[PDB]
């Protein structure tokens, strides 16, 4: 069994440039930036598929 990647998911090649440090609510969170929009997501929760 290999689960299918669902419908809304955006493929992203991993690269170091993606994950980075950033200030986020008085903490130095390991922010991820999503290349389709360029938006930063410091928390692992709430990130786009």
């Amino acid at each position: 069994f290999v689960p299918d990647v669902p419908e809304g998911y955006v493929a992203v090649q991993y690269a170091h440039r993606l994950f980075s440090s950033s200030l986020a609510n008085k903490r130095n969170r390991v922010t991820y930036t999503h290349p389709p929009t360029g938006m930063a997501y410091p928390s692992p929760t709430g990130r786009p598929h």
Binding site: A24, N25, K26, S43, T45
Partner: protein, 50 residues
Amino acid sequence: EAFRWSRYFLDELQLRRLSVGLRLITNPRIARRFNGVRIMYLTDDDPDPD
């Protein structure tokens, strides 16, 4: 005339004080027993009691 009402069998001053006390008891700042909680799976970013 003293028998017309028991006045709950209290002194007149205990009544007059009882008044202000009822004013204390219903002050919002004292009302600090809280009712009901909401369970929800959320990050504690920038916590505030309120």
